Amino acid sequence: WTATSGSCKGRCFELQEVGPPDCRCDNLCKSYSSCCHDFDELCLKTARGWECTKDRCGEVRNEENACHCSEDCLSRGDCCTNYQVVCKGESHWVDDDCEEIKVPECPAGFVRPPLIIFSVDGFRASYMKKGSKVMPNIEKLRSCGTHAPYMRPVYPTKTFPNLYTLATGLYPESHGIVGNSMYDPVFDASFHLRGREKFNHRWWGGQPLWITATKQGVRAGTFFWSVSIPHERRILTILQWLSLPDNERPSVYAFYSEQPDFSGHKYGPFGPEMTNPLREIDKTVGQLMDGLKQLRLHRCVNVIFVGDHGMEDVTCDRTEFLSNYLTNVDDITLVPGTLGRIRAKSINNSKYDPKTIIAALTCKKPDQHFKPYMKQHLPKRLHYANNRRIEDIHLLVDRRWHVARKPLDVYKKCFFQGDHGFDNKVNSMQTVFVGYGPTFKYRTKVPPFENIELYNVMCDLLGLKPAPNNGTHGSLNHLLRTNTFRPTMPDEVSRPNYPGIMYLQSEFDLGCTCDDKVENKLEELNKRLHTKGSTKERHLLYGRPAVLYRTSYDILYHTDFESGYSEIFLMPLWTSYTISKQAEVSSIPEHLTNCVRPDVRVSPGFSQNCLAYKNDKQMSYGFLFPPYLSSSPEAKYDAFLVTNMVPMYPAFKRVWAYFQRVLVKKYASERNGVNVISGPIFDYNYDGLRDTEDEIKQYVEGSSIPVPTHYYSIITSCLDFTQPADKCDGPLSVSSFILPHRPDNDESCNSSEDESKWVEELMKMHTARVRDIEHLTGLDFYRKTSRSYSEILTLKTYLHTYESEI
Ligand SMILES: *[C@@H]1O[C@H](CO)[C@@H](O[C@@H]2O[C@H](CO)[C@@H](O[C@@H]3O[C@H](CO[C@H]4O[C@H](CO)[C@@H](O)[C@H](O[C@H]5O[C@H](CO)[C@@H](O)[C@H](O)[C@@H]5O[C@H]5O[C@H](CO)[C@@H](O)[C@H](O)[C@@H]5O)[C@@H]4O)[C@@H](O)[C@H](O[C@H]4O[C@H](CO)[C@@H](O)[C@H](O)[C@@H]4O[C@H]4O[C@H](CO)[C@@H](O)[C@H](O)[C@@H]4O)[C@@H]3O)[C@H](O)[C@H]2NC(C)=O)[C@H](O)[C@H]1NC(C)=O
Ligand SMILES: CCn1ccc2c(OC(C)C)cc(C(=O)N3C[C@@H]4[C@H]5CN(C(=O)c6ccc7[nH]nnc7c6)C[C@H]5[C@@H]4C3)cc21
Ligand SMILES: [Ca+2]
Ligand SMILES: [Cl-]
Ligand code: NA
Numbered sequence: 001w002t003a004t005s006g007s008c009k010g011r012c013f014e015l016q017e018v019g020p021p022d023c024r025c026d027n028l029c030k031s032y033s034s035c036c037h038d039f040d041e042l043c044l045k046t047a048r049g050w051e052c053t054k055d056r057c058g059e060v061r062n063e064e065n066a067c068h069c070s071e072d073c074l075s076r077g078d079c080c081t082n083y084q085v086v087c088k089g090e091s092h093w094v095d096d097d098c099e100e101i102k103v104p105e106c107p108a109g110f111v112r113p114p115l116i117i118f119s120v121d122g123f124r125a126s127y128m129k130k131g132s133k134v135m136p137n138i139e140k141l142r143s144c145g146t147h148a149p150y151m152r153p154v155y156p157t158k159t160f161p162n163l164y165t166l167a168t169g170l171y172p173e174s175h176g177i178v179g180n181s182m183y184d185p186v187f188d189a190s191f192h193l194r195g196r197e198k199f200n201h202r203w204w205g206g207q208p209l210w211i212t213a214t215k216q217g218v219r220a221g222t223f224f225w226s227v228s229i230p231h232e233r234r235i236l237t238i239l240q241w242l243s244l245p246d247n248e249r250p251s252v253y254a255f256y257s258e259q260p261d262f263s264g265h266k267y268g269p270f271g272p273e274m275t276n277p278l279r280e281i282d283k284t285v286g287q288l289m290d291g292l293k294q295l296r297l298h299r300c301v302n303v304i305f306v307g308d309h310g311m312e313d314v315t316c317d318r319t320e321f322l323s324n325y326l327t328n329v330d331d332i333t334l335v336p337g338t339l340g341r342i343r344a345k346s347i348n349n350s351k352y353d354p355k356t357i358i359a360a361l362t363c364k365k366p367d368q369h370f371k372p373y374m375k376q377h378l379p380k381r382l383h384y385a386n387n388r389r390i391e392d393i394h395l396l397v398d399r400r401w402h403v404a405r406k407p408l409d410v411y412k413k414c415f416f417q418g419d420h421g422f423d424n425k426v427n428s429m430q431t432v433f434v435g436y437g438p439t440f441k442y443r444t445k446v447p448p449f450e451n452i453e454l455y456n457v458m459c460d461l462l463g464l465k466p467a468p469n470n471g472t473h474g475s476l477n478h479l480l481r482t483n484t485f486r487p488t489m490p491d492e493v494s495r496p497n498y499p500g501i502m503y504l505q506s507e508f509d510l511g512c513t514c515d516d517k518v519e520n521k522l523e524e525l526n527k528r529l530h531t532k533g534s535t536k537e538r539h540l541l542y543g544r545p546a547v548l549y550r551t552s553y554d555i556l557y558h559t560d561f562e563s564g565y566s567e568i569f570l571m572p573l574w575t576s577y578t579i580s581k582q583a584e585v586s587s588i589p590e591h592l593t594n595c596v597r598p599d600v601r602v603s604p605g606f607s608q609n610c611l612a613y614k615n616d617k618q619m620s621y622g623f624l625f626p627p628y629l630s631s632s633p634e635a636k637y638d639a640f641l642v643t644n645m646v647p648m649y650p651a652f653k654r655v656w657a658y659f660q661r662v663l664v665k666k667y668a669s670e671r672n673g674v675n676v677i678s679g680p681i682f683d684y685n686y687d688g689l690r691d692t693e694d695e696i697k698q699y700v701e702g703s704s705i706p707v708p709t710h711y712y713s714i715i716t717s718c719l720d721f722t723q724p725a726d727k728c729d730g731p732l733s734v735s736s737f738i739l740p741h742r743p744d745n746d747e748s749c750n751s752s753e754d755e756s757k758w759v760e761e762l763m764k765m766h767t768a769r770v771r772d773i774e775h776l777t778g779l780d781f782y783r784k785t786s787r788s789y790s791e792i793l794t795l796k797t798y799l800h801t802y803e804s805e806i
């Protein structure tokens, strides 16, 4: 109940929400059908429109007018935004040459530069170039300020997940807004675009920017606008708030535009009807900047112009129907569209079986336009599994397509020509970022980055300590002129042991064999040197990784590679090696095919054994440093040590051997040498974080050898590829992956073909940031470079996407 009998007189767009049943006058009251009876009349004035005209100049104030052109309007803070242009012969902001803003130029009593977040829904990255002729205000912000060529959204590329990620710095699996529609099985409640359940606080996790600000004594404008409040009134409201006394005035403000998303759905991303919405958004930016210039705040405020996601061509006819695949389609519930989420229609149905649904949806049609996954098998870069609102069965939909349960859902729920939601690396889903103001740099282009990083920077701009989040604080320091955040590298928690030769061959009873008993002071001294670390500077180029948790491990040196060997998990945590451009690939010699050799530096008790692999009929093994890339026949024996062995399903060995035998040398050729660090990952609870030993669900049969859920590799070279990877003076270049360690290749529909036709495609889908690997391993990489720490933070957040140019 709202007793809408109170009044909005002197309360229009009040910042504190008053509690039911008292009537509200805040910018959201319409959304809750809760506004006082005189809210439209007093707060949503429209009379005479939004612009001064010559005949209005110097007028007698009429409080009925939408905005004012009278002599008093500046002191009142309510002039029309073009007042000074029309009436005082000033220029529009967009017509002034840009001039660097070296320091805040703020009025007396401003404690900090205010921040204004100008968010545009569905603003695809390529609109910044493609629409630049019709968007002169936005083009001045972009060219004069700090911009990226695009900013990567989170998955799914839907409105609420991305808006709340911008606000929190968190992945949707962590903030809890994992779609525009959701079912939470614990609450037994549904979140929908229409209706009241979405207003319940229990959906919204983490700590959004407006709460972080308020808790730390920084006042925030209300971020949310009822859809029916016109944009001109939203801008005038912000400009009025900026005129408040010092003690009442917010320091952070948000504007939101439903365009260009609203038209993009109707017309497609580049429909000819899209020019007008882009022109209207640009006019809104012009009103804000003219209004700021009128208040002498246009070289005081930091402005962020940011989108949530892009927009792709999608029409009714490109829909896949589950009724074409499933015999049992009425027993499932699908959340449909540009991603699919499947669960049982009834929890009382004992016949429901996810394995049979996945199989029925796997590689069934030649050009099938979706791929089913259990959520734990989704690419780890999506970080889309650790939330009970994410259904176990997920369908990744190809760009330009939809999935639906039955055809009647599509024509009986055509219209639309655009949509979004697809994989966040898809080029059409990328969006925009520009920052303009005293705290951002001048005429500066920065490389693409992810939207989870922006919460930390907004906290930086307001002097706030961010709540714990998934950004890497410091990684965006290169956007900023001041207020950088300068972190220290984390402290190493476990120091390594450096074992020498401690065991005799006969102490090992591992069931392993090797034809290596074939036999010199010249050469013998040289091999002892290699085992003591004499080639380590060639193969460990950026320092050893730091281990950030408590464990027991050994560093092991060899001619061609260095590793950090875990006594607890019985395999390397990491193996590091450098392959120059001139390196030659060789075969595994016949006499060594089944060779595994005890490592006399490491106890039998801390080693794997071959008999376990012989007994486990599903499990084989591979090697982290590949025998194919040995530097000499004698060095190749090191590659067959038991301490270089890892458990691998035969299906996965197809992938790994092609990577090792073919792709590593191809990358070294292409990049002028590469340094490779590879290793296992254990994430049985799919939380994106390193498992402890008691979280491991699968072991090589009969043994204590844990089975990895994934295998990673980090591939680093010199950004200036005229310098070899091992002799690089400047910035680095990286690409990485996290491959799922699966007992079949069902994910790859062409896997019956030669690995040259499918493996690299798999690896691109599972591209990763170094930072993703850090979370999954508890390791910290690039500890010893000659580069600035913030530059290394940016490197660790890089994702190689393999998409063509935006
Ligand atoms: C991305 O950044 C984020 C933020 O840094 C990272 O997320 C953090 O990860 C931490 C480790 O997983 C996690 O720490 C846990 O916190 C528990 C207390 O949490 C509550 O309070 C905090 C603080 O206000 C709050 O933020 C939490 O909010 C979560 O839950 C509510 C309700 O579900 C949601 O609305 C909200 O969205 C958020 O959910 C998300 O996280 C939870 C996990 O908390 C997931 O389950 C959800 O799916 C969703 O992803 C909470 O309100 C605390 O209880 C945990 O402690 C257990 O484990 C420790 C080990 O240190 C042990 O010592 C403790 O005793 C305890 O064990 C006991 O509980 C076990 C489980 O019940 C039980 O088995 C044992 O026997 C014991 O009884 C733990 O410390 C932190 O909460 C989240 N924060 C957020 C916001 O998500 C995230 O990891 C980063 N991602 C990557 C990839 O790097
Ligand atoms: C900078 C502004 N800003 C930052 C966070 C934030 C926000 O966070 C909440 C999620 C708590 C909400 C806001 C905020 O005011 N809103 C108002 C609108 C809500 C209703 N929507 C829809 O009808 C909708 C729109 C496009 C779609 N495409 N495909 N399907 C779609 C369904 C989504 C939400 C939009 C954002 C603005 C916000
Ligand atoms: Ca884990
Ligand atoms: Cl109302
Ligand atoms: Na053997």
Ligand code: NA
Residues within 6 Å of the ligand: 612, 613, 614, 615, 616, 617, 618, 619, 620
């Ligand atoms: Na086996």
Ligand code: NA
Residues within 6 Å of the ligand: 745, 746, 747, 748, 749, 750, 751, 752
């Ligand atoms: Na296959």
Ligand SMILES: [Zn+2]
Residues within 6 Å of the ligand: 122, 159, 261, 262, 265, 420
């Ligand atoms: Zn939309």
